[PDB]
Symmetry: D2
Subunit: 318 residues, 4 copies
Amino acid sequence: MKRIGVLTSGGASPGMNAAIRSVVRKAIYHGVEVYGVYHGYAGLIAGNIKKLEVGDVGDIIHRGGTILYTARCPEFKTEEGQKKGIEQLKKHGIEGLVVIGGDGSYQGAKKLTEHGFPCVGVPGTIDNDIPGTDFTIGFDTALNTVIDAIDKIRDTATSHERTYVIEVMGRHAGDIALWSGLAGGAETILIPEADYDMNDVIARLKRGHERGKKHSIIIVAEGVGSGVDFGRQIQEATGFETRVTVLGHVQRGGSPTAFDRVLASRLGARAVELLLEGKGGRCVGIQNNQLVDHDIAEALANKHTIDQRMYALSKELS
Amino acid sequence: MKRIGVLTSGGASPGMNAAIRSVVRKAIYHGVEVYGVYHGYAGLIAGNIKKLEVGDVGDIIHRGGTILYTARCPEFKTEEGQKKGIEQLKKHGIEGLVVIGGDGSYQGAKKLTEHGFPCVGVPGTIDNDIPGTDFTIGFDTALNTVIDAIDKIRDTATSHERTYVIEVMGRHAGDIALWSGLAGGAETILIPEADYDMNDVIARLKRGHERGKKHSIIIVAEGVGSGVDFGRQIQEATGFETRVTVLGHVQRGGSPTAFDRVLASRLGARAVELLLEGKGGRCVGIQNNQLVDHDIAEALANKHTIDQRMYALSKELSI
Amino acid sequence: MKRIGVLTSGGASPGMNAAIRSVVRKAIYHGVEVYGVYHGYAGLIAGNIKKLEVGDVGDIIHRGGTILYTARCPEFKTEEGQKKGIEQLKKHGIEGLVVIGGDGSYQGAKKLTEHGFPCVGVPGTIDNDIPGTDFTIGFDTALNTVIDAIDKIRDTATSHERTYVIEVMGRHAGDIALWSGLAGGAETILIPEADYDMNDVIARLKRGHERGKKHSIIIVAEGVGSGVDFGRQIQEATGFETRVTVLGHVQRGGSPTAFDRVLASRLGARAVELLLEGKGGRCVGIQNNQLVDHDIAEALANKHTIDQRMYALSKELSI
Amino acid sequence: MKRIGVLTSGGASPGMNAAIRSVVRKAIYHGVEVYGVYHGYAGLIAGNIKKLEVGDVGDIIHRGGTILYTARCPEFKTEEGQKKGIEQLKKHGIEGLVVIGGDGSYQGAKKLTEHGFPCVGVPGTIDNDIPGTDFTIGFDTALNTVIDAIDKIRDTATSHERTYVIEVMGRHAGDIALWSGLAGGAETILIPEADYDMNDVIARLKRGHERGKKHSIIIVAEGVGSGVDFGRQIQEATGFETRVTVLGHVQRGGSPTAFDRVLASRLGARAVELLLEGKGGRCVGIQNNQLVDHDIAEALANKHTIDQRMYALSKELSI
């Protein structure tokens, strides 16, 4: 390929810029041209396209967010929209596309290949909810953002404010909550992939309160419910003053950790390799500490799960 | 004096441990013993008191929280509680008490000295709402905790998600919201002191959406209302999708910044000087970048005010 | 005036971007245009100049370094260079210049002012060594970068290997060393502004070890000497294993703290006010926690000092 | 078992406390008592041992260092010391030992193992140089400490000072340098496990400035040489001003990252299970993202390697 393109879609994840940097440098290394597609598939249809030079990625490896931006584009989820995209790619001489984003962005990667445009998906999201990869780019950073908040909460325990609820992201995937909860030494972790009894939870608060536990910290994945609601119900049920933190989109931001930069760099480069190998409709990932790549359709067909042992471990440790 | 005591009261504040360290080390340097009182005034009344050795404060300067803990004590708001408190101090041969905390800790200090027991207040709280000091110990750390959140939100630029409400601590004082908002480049800051026109907030929003502004960040002091409420109001009224962060007690936690450890070290040491030089019923502070102390009652009689020019400036820099 | 300019000179300082943003926004608030001058005085001479739009500082408040870049320029020390600069300014319609930087950047502002061109200086450097201000923009951030290192070192103590020497920046000023050493609980601090005695030092270290002091941390301002050398000088004197950290230029990098962003915002805006009021040849600062401005020549005439009580306090607390 | 023990040996490593916490909590869940052995093997021989209550580990998961302390012990490398150790263990009714530390600590585990005392090794070090595991507890945290410095150096840019040398830890392993180098966007990485042509290095450096590279960063593992010496070679060969930063022991310090805390928790817990399962003379680890365990002596026979494709990757990306 003489020229490829790269875009980000699905909302920000720390390490997207590291991944863009890798795609650009890896391709330029092999003599390939790289074009930035701004604003995701929306910018693709709109022809918001511009060459990325070696220097254009020379100061971004440590930056959060994405220099290419992202934008939702339902228009691309249609035939006429995909056609506008294809047309814009051909007009710019772009022969293949690296798509960095969430599972949603993958669908578009697939369609493009079917119409003779090799596209490879790179997992950029904090959710860690993409099949065919143990870890998505940004998950590690989000975890550290979450434990930063948990650590600070540990300093604030008094006798009358001793119970804390922290709501983290994770609409369907409990990964953020589970890993954060374990690393944060949380007493209770509520996730969608595991059922919980609010009585067992309240019972656990009291047991801790009895043996003199300095603080009870409850981690709640957003997919399970509102931090505000859980906290209010707990206070209502126990008489214990309950304080609530809702991190929100903070979890998507900040400079990527070392693990995210490294993962981003490897997957990004791997994506370029696949295109040059003539492969397409593939997504990259890491599995058992090894770089893998799967057919998009096959990968998307699996169901994401969490490590139950780790969930169980977290209960033992508290 | 041969023996003094030290205690922490009110919410946790980053730098409390640095203040405790300073109290202990400054006293020991002058050949005075320091006894730790645990759990604030509740612990004082209960007699939860124990000598602090030089090594008990050797690894705390950089630690958040307070090794002495804090606990509510309504009883100490009565003659009975004050008497019990004094009984315990006397029983342990404690001749003066350094109290590190917020507004309500100072009331206890005033009452104590009105009862003939030497007591000095040190301003330990994040919300900068203590008389006789430009800055309380913990405020600067809290500010940095808030902008950490704001900075991360600036990395999340989705075209349809560019409106963010962040609820910070305040209640009565808008200092945290004001300083973190100015430092964080917030578009709008809602503080309890000033009036706000929701009409103005929305117009400023739209004005920024038109000009292509990538992030609209609104800081709301809890004293003004709930971030979630405002987020809903703003989305209902503009159709701009609005995301909300409520930081909560994260703002009280974490390792103190350099400024807070310095302030804490200087102020804790001064409180000791005041006790050893016969003074009492005073609180320490920093004003116009100078170490000061005041009669507690006199200081408590002044209303706290936010810097009005800084508020005005923040509005000039956003637009 | 209807058009001003702004540039950055001297080493990079965290908060420079916050200052730039404030200059642009404040000017724009009063209907005035701002043109950025890139690569410092060098860029001013070479005519590297471009208008700054409101969107060009819309995302920098939290960024370290400077989007206008900085560079050395000996030519601007000469009258030919200075003239070529005004030439370039008047070519672009710039009626006043804001200069954000260290000592050196102030000389150029003096000269431009001697040549009848309205210029105001803003103190941007980490070493706190700029007259007419208690604190320079960047100082607070550097202290926090230093204590982050000191904090990590505390985690690595081991009774046999427990003596650490950290060398910090500050060419001729011991502010960084003094504040960071007080904030980090250092046992000993070496700065140009106070005589030291390695014997008095060695004894400290031993008395500390005698009573089982967990760790011994020594902070050394680079203007006093090398840390690697004080390290070697300390081992063969006590037999104590000694580790040395030299931080170097990390102290200049990083996102500015809340205090630096606030200072930078207040000083930047004040610099614009001065120009628009026709009051060039000044520098701005904060003194006794109030905003101030001074004639540059007069300010530069003042010698730099530190708070001796604070140095004395750090000695008292490290027992 | 009714009662086991845990200690830490080798340098300090972030996550040791999370590991200690997990050993203690996991044991308690199974109704086993845990006794702390302070100061590693030195303390074991000396009988520096005390029961750890469930509350002794209640606030350490996020703390750097180790509450049990670490110490060197040549004595334990001898038959006599080993027996005194076992004697002290029996003396306290300790039936099994969890050893958290570096490969030095594993030797002692193997030895207590040849003596028929149940011991499980847990890999706690930053250099990632321990057999039977892809990652050691503390490695990830150290990487992030290194890139924090590299990131700040990026804010420090000029035409004059554009070349930076950073010396990082690792002992005999290049892992820290390779991973931090890749994560930090280093132009050149010098590690023990791969040959380097200094002229290629020099040539690559010039190649970069010719094309106006923002900053040139070079990472040097300490086991390859001295940062200061490389920086001199480079300034002398290019005339480019080269600033050296030697991070030193700061890399061992700080609060563990999420991954280190999770790793520590899992490996600590697994280590206890192995003792209760009547195993011993094993070390635990993570390989291919799965919990594993191996015979100590066997694992100790494997040579350390790094990912060479990763190394090549770093070369490709820094053009």
